[PDB]
Structure 1
């Protein structure tokens, strides 16, 4: 939700951002909000005018109580004021709603460090890491995406895609999943199941060590926490609702982690609050027609360990940088070459004020694909969920700043590992880091 004060104090700043985001259809709202914000405040002025009047008309009837007291009239102007007052109050109540309706539907204001853009072809690579194994036939595309800024090694043989690797490794059954649940669902098997749990614990351990309290939240939540975590557009695009219940399947532990302190007032001394959640994630993937069919990259369900941070507005950005790094450290340990990216305004999304994505090099696809996403939501969620805080019990509670970020979303990490650590015969070597969790050190294909 946007801050009424902001629209009042700089409509041009907002209007321009709405345009950087490509949401022209809404710039016309800025004016309509003030239009209403204005009627709202004059009607207030009137009510007070009115309240003061009744006081005056009150003492006046008293003065006449001693006189001829022809107060039949005054007692009528009174009944009028009270008639008016309520009507106004109601009229005002109506304006606040129309105003709020629009405020809840406006994207967070972007930070000036956000590059201006149209789509994802305008995001901006700002850091690289690792030695990318590149197939001869990808050389140019790789170099365009790496900006020559990434170290690599050429491969004569062609790397296989994760979907194939899974099959030769006996790691999954797609056919049957489709029979049982439809498309974009899967049955994970053997080593791959351990690997999955393996990545969860790993992610868990690290964030805990860095002082995050581990939490397993409810997988189903009440509509308001979804309305307070993303835009109302997600209700059609991604969230599943269960029949006859005010219950929605969470698409990320982020949401329940945020609704955790809805309607509270935190004690500034506890801040920052550091949570690392684990939960299955459910997403409709309605907008995707056929961009990633069969496989476990763009699916309806998956596991993800998530970082959630409650901070004071002055430490948020410093934190935003901290979490994305926490995320980076994990993949480095997984020996997964990648590139962090600063997402532009057009592809930024309603909630984030600034977003950092870690796209991993995929030796098979010959391109970088999102693997983690770190966002600073400033006060957008707070303002919605009414999450405020105070330093001294004396006065005014201020809204806190919330930040979220993937640690490891298992499905997409497994792809990364599979494509990045494969060998000519299909064998996949597990990063040494994960040995204590997996047991095995590699996954050989069936037929040996």
Structure 2
């Protein structure tokens, strides 16, 4: 939700951002909310004018009670003021309603640092890490995507896709999942199940060492926490609703983590509130149904360890910068080469002001693929969920800033590990850092 103040004190700023975002069909809204806001304040001034008249007509009726007192008329004028006052009041409500409708449907204003672009092809790489294992046949793509700024080793044999590796490793059963639930669902098996849990504990442990309170949130939440966390389009594209209830399956622990303090005035001495949640995630992935990667890259359910932050507006950008580094550390320990990107205006999304993604190099796919997202949400969620804070019981509570970032979404971490640590025969070596969690050091093909 946008602050009405901001559109009043700089409509051109919001219109131009809408254009940098590709939300042109919504530029015409800035003026609409303005003329509505204007009408809103005009009627209110009218109401006070009337409240004042009510007072005058009052002292006047009584002033006659001592005199001739032909009041009758004054009493009828009095009757019209209340009649009128009520109307204006109800007219002012409807007006606030139309104004907020737009306010809730406008994306967060982007930060000056986010590059301008049309889509994912305009995202800007800003950092690279690791030594990529590239197939001779992906060399140009790799080089263009890495901008020659990343170390790499050329591979003789052709590296396999994660889906095929799950098969040779006996780690999944897709066909029986399709029979039981439909496409893009799966049964995960054997060592891959241990690997999934291991990834959760590892992520969990590290964020805990950095001071994050671990949490297992509700997996089903009430509609308001969903509309308080993202744009309404998500109800059609990503979010599942459960029949006959005000319950929605969460698409990320982020949402229940943000609703956690809905309608609170936090005590500033506590900020920043640091949460690291674990939870399964459910998404419709409606926009797609059969794009390309056929295993566990883009499915209906996956596990994710999530970082969530409540900070002072003056501390958020610094936090943003820390959470993305927190995710970067995990993948470095997991020995996964990657590049982090600054997402452009057109591929940014409604909630964030600025967003960084970690796209891991996927030897088999021959490309960098999103594996984590870190967003600084400014006060966009706070203004919706009414999450404020006060430093002195004195007064004036202000909205907090919220941030979120993937620590590890196991689904894609597993693909990154299978594709990046595979050997010619299919054997997949597991990063030393996880040995304490898994037991085994590698996963060998079955026969």
Tell me the TM-score normalized by structure 2.
1.00
Q: 2: distance between equivalents of 1:81 and 1:160?
A: 79
Alpha-carbon displacement from aligned partner over 1:314-345 (angstroms, at most 9, x marks no partner): 00000000000000000000000000000000
**How far has the Cα of 1:67 moved from its partner?**
1.3
**How far has the Cα of 1:292 moved from its partner?**
3.0
**How far has the Cα of 1:313 moved from its partner?**
0.2
Q: 2: distance between equivalents of 1:158 and 1:392?
A: 63
Q: Secondary structure at the match of 2:347?
A: coil
Instruction: Tell whether the 8 Å contact from 1:306 to 1:406 is kept in structure 2 after alignment.
Output: yes
Q: Secondary structure at the match of 1:425?
A: coil
Q: Secondary structure at the match of 1:39?
A: helix
**How far has the Cα of 1:289 moved from its partner?**
3.5
**Paired position in structure 1 for 2:188:** 188
Q: Secondary structure at the match of 2:345?
A: coil
Say what the alpha-carbon RMSD is for the aligned residues.
Answer: 0.5
Instruction: Tell whether the 8 Å contact from 1:15 to 1:30 is kept in structure 2 after alignment.
Output: yes
Alpha-carbon displacement from aligned partner over 1:33-68 (angstroms, at most 9, x marks no partner): 000000000101010000000101111111111111
Q: 1: distance between equivalents of 2:114 and 2:62?
A: 66
Instruction: Tell whether the 8 Å contact from 1:292 to 1:298 is kept in structure 2 after alignment.
Output: no
**Paired position in structure 2 for 1:86:** 86
**Paired position in structure 2 for 1:148:** 148
Q: Secondary structure at the match of 2:81?
A: helix
Instruction: Tell whether the 8 Å contact from 1:168 to 1:426 is kept in structure 2 after alignment.
Output: yes
**How far has the Cα of 1:290 moved from its partner?**
2.2
Instruction: Tell whether the 8 Å contact from 1:382 to 1:401 is kept in structure 2 after alignment.
Output: yes
**Paired position in structure 2 for 1:72:** 72
Q: 1: distance between equivalents of 2:442 and 2:57?
A: 89
Instruction: Tell whether the 8 Å contact from 1:133 to 1:155 is kept in structure 2 after alignment.
Output: yes
Q: 2: distance between equivalents of 1:294 and 1:367?
A: 16
Q: 2: distance between equivalents of 1:245 and 1:266?
A: 30
Q: Secondary structure at the match of 1:196?
A: helix
Instruction: Tell whether the 8 Å contact from 1:250 to 1:256 is kept in structure 2 after alignment.
Output: yes
**How far has the Cα of 1:369 moved from its partner?**
0.2
Runs of 4 or more above 2 Å deviation: none
**How far has the Cα of 1:293 moved from its partner?**
4.8
Alpha-carbon displacement from aligned partner over 1:269-318 (angstroms, at most 9, x marks no partner): 00000000000000001001422352000000000000000001000000
Instruction: Tell whether the 8 Å contact from 1:115 to 1:344 is kept in structure 2 after alignment.
Output: yes
Note the residue ranges of structure 1 that are not aligned, 5 or more in a row: none
**Paired position in structure 2 for 1:395:** 395
Q: 2: distance between equivalents of 1:439 and 1:293?
A: 29
**How far has the Cα of 1:113 moved from its partner?**
0.4
Instruction: Tell whether the 8 Å contact from 1:184 to 1:293 is kept in structure 2 after alignment.
Output: no
Alpha-carbon displacement from aligned partner over 1:225-275 (angstroms, at most 9, x marks no partner): 000000000000000000000000000000000000000000000000000
Q: 2: distance between equivalents of 1:172 and 1:80?
A: 75
